[PDB]
Amino acid sequence: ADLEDNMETLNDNLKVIEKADNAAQVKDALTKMRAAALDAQKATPPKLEDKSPDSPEMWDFRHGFDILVCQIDDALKLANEGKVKEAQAAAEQLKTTCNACHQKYR
Amino acid sequence: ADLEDNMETLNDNLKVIEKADNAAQVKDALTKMRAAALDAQKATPPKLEDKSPDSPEMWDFRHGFDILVCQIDDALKLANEGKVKEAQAAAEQLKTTCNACHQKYR
Ligand code: HEM
Ligand code: HEM
Numbered sequence: 485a486d487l488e489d490n491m492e493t494l495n496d497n498l499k500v501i502e503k504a505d506n507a508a509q510v511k512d513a514l515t516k517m518r519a520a521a522l523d524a525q526k527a528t529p530p531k532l533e534d535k536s537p538d539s540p541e542m543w544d545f546r547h548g549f550d551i552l553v554c555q556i557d558d559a560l561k562l563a564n565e566g567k568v569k570e571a572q573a574a575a576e577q578l579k580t581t582c583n584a585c586h587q588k589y590r
Numbered sequence: 591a592d593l594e595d596n597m598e599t600l601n602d603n604l605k606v607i608e609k610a611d612n613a614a615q616v617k618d619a620l621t622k623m624r625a626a627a628l629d630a631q632k633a634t635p636p637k638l639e640d641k642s643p644d645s646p647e648m649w650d651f652r653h654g655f656d657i658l659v660c661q662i663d664d665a666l667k668l669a670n671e672g673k674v675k676e677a678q679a680a681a682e683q684l685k686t687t688c689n690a691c692h693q694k695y696r
């Protein structure tokens with residue numbers, strides 16, 4: 485999927501997590517988020533079509549996703565432990581990463 | 591210590607590790623390396639005095655050290671396990687990181 489498609493998946497599964505009643509629901513959402521983030525990692529944002537592929541901006545763009553995935557896996561660990569409330573909190577804390585990358589490259 | 595001083599510590603403790611007879615020797619060297627890398631992380635290379643402190647180049651410069659420290663800790667884990675030969679091998683593998691950062695910012 486393109487960058488846009490993946491971003492929507494991420495954005496939509498965040499609210500889904502924000503409404504979840506149980507762990508299984510959070511896990512599903514987070515699992516979908518993880519996949520989309522990895523796939524997004526491969527795209528080249530429109531604001532970096534120029535910059536060479538090995539550009540320092542690009543590496544920061546891709547590195548942004550390794551942080552999101554690490555964060556996402558921690559949320560899954562929590563969801564896996566039945567701690568639904570803090571798996572949700574962990575979910576929110578992801579926005580920090582989201583925003584960070586958005587103001588530099590979006 | 592300045593960037594230069596720290597780099598020398600790193601460079602010299604690498605050979606020391608390359609000559610070590612035992613684990614304790616590797617650990618000492620690596621411990622000195624870890625400290626110097628962290629301290630180096632704070633300096634601003636001469637080729638980045640201009641670029642703003644929050645510059646994408648700077649963050650890559652500092653991030654370079656988080657990789658070196660992670661690598662260094664893995665070497666210590668190995669040295670801690672008595673595996674002197676592979677703690678040494680792990681040591682060498684560090685050069686990849688060293689070079690990488692050198693050709694971009696040195
Ligand atoms: C964090 C989990 C996260 C969310 C949520 C998110 C959402 C998001 C939206 C809603 C858009 C709009 C896309 C559209 O037009 O439909 C958007 C756009 C971009 N994002 Fe994003 N995004 C999240 C995380 C990240 C991360 C960690 C990065 C950087 C590694 C990133 C980057 C981008 C870019 C580029 C765009 C613009 C895409 C385009 O203009 O085509 N996002 N994101
Ligand atoms: C890896 C373990 C590593 C070694 C070894 C190393 C050595 C090294 C030397 C020998 C110099 C010369 C410094 C001097 O003039 O005495 C040097 C210089 C720089 N380095 Fe280095 N260095 C290692 C690792 C790293 C890493 C991971 C970075 C980046 C995060 C880095 C950066 C630099 C920079 C900048 C210089 C130049 C300093 C200056 O010109 O004042 N090094 N390094």
Ligand SMILES: CC(=O)Nc1ccc(O)c2ncccc12
Pocket residue numbers: 550551553554555653656
């Ligand atoms: C969960 C988390 O914060 N992860 C990370 C933080 C900082 C980094 O530089 C990372 N780099 C590569 C992969 C994960 C990283």
Ligand SMILES: CC(=O)Nc1ccc(O)c2ncccc12
Pocket residue numbers: 547550656657659660661
């Ligand atoms: C041992 C090792 O390779 N570490 C790392 C690899 C890649 C990263 O992006 C990292 N980020 C922050 C800290 C360590 C990192």
Ligand code: NI
Pocket residue numbers: 547550653656
């Ligand atoms: Ni990293």
